[PDB]
Amino acid sequence: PKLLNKFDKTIKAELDAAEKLRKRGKIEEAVNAFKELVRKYPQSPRARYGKAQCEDDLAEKRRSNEVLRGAIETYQEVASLPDVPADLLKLSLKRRSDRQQFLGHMRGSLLTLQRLVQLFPNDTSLKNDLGVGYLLIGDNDNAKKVYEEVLSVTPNDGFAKVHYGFILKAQNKIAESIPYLKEGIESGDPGTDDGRFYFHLGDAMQRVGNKEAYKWYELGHKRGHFASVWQRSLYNVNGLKAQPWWTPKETGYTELVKSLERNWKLIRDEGLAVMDKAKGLFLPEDENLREKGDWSQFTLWQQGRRNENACKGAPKTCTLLEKFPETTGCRRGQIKYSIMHPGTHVWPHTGPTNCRLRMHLGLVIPKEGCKIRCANETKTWEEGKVLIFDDSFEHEVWQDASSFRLIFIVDVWHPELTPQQRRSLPAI
Numbered sequence: 001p002k003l004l005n006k007f008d009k010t011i012k013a014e015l016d017a018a019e020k021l022r023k024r025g026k027i028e029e030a031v032n033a034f035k036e037l038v039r040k041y042p043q044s045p046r047a048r049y050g051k052a053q054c055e056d057d058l059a060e061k062r063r064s065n066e067v068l069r070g071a072i073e074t075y076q077e078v079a080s081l082p083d084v085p086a087d088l089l090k091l092s093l094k095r096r097s098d099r100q101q102f103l104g105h106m107r108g109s110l111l112t113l114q115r116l117v118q119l120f121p122n123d124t125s126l127k128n129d130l131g132v133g134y135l136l137i138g139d140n141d142n143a144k145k146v147y148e149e150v151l152s153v154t155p156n157d158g159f160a161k162v163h164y165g166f167i168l169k170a171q172n173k174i175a176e177s178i179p180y181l182k183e184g185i186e187s188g189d190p191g192t193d194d195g196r197f198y199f200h201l202g203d204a205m206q207r208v209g210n211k212e213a214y215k216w217y218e219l220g221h222k223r224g225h226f227a228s229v230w231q232r233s234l235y236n237v238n239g240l241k242a243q244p245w246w247t248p249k250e251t252g253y254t255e256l257v258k259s260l261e262r263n264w265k266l267i268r269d270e271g272l273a274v275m276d277k278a279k280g281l282f283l284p285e286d287e288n289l290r291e292k293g294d295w296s297q298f299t300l301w302q303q304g305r306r307n308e309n310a311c312k313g314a315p316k317t318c319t320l321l322e323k324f325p326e327t328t329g330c331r332r333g334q335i336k337y338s339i340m341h342p343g344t345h346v347w348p349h350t351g352p353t354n355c356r357l358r359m360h361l362g363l364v365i366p367k368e369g370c371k372i373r374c375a376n377e378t379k380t381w382e383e384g385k386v387l388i389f390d391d392s393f394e395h396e397v398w399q400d401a402s403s404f405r406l407i408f409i410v411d412v413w414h415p416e417l418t419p420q421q422r423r424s425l426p427a428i
């Protein structure tokens with residue numbers, strides 16, 4: 001790569017030093033060197049480019065945005081000087097865009113990418129990156145137009161294909177998204193071996209009733225994107241017993257389970273009263289997971305935080321749960337009532353973390369028609385009885401009964417997490 005043009009080429013003899021004072025790892029040296037060559041040879045592009053790469057690394061070191069924000073401008077400075085090597089120009093603005101994205105300046109990074117495409121209107125790689133810039137600001141229509149131009153010129157570019165598929169899927173063109181994601185992934189091209197595209201390919205296939213989704217999930221597993229073909233959560237802790245269904249005894253949380261089973265009519269009655277008196281406290285569940293039907297939830301604890309207005313409506317239930325911080329303190333979980341009406345189907349999905357187990361207490365369960373699957377096992381609820389599964393494993397639900405189904409959902413920390421783990425895990 002030709003980063004040295006005439007104007008600089010003369011004074012390369014000293015350039016090598018500064019860059020190796022970096023490679024050496026003596027960043028302090030490298031910075032001051034390049035800064036000194038900045039004043040000795042203002043005009044030099046490589047001189048600038050060096051000061052910026054120094055600042056970039058000195059920021060990773062100190063972990064200082066303020067620092068990195070300095071580099072982002074110096075990368076811009078490389079691109080103001082004259083007869084700047086196009087290799088070096090591409091390099092510097094590519095890095096600025098990346099660093100802009102790192103800090104959250106998505107539109108700023110888009111502007112940089114827009115500039116690079118104007119400078120280099122035949123670099124496909126840069127158009128691909130521009131489309132990401134558009135995605136990162138939510139402008140999928142302009143991202144769609146970019147990947148269409150690329151595909152018009154390079155019809156087998158896997159990076160554009162998988163991104164085109166994503167955009168199609170997000171425009172509710174689900175069946176059309178699938179071959180784009182399949183072919184992009186199978187191209188093996190750089191940037192296509194990303195767990196997000198396996199996730200979307202399998203979701204799309206499931207949603208059009210294509211059993212081949214699990215092949216791709218298994219391939220995702222083999223490629224490191226998923227714990228297994230069934231357990232596909234994103235935010236995981238290693239070393240936690242992984243099984244879809246659990247018994248109370250297996251969890252150790254036997255006193256919690258007893259308190260829920262033994263006081264279940266109280267728990268029921270408070271929820272039914274909120275249904276009757278404050279029905280708008282039950283909020284509609286995830287529209288994305290809802291194929292059809294009527295499905296709503298009344299949350300008492302969100303990520304370790306008590307909802308106080310909720311507990312004024314379910315006072316005795318909240319008071320009961322206070323005794324069990326394995327759930328009230330589960331920052332990766334929830335505690336919520338959940339009502340599902342006839343004609344409801346919940347798409348197969350997993351939750352976000354393997355750090356919780358999900359308990360379901362049955363409160364109002366019609367005698368036929370309600371069922372939940374987790375992995376290969378399909379079960380049903382019972383009034384006053386708790387079911388426990390690991391919702392990081394794919395689960396799916398159906399409500400084909402003649403009246404409403406009410407359950408009570410209680411997340412607990414995975415029982416193998418140690419107290420210090422429970423204490424230090426970020427919430428989600």
Ligand SMILES: O=C(O)C(=O)C[C@@H](O)C(=O)O
Nearest residue numbers: 338339340391395397409
């Ligand atoms: O508990 C979950 O994680 C579910 O996906 C289903 C649940 O919300 C329900 O009402 O049946």
Ligand SMILES: [Mn+2]
Nearest residue numbers: 350351391395
């Ligand atoms: Mn779920």
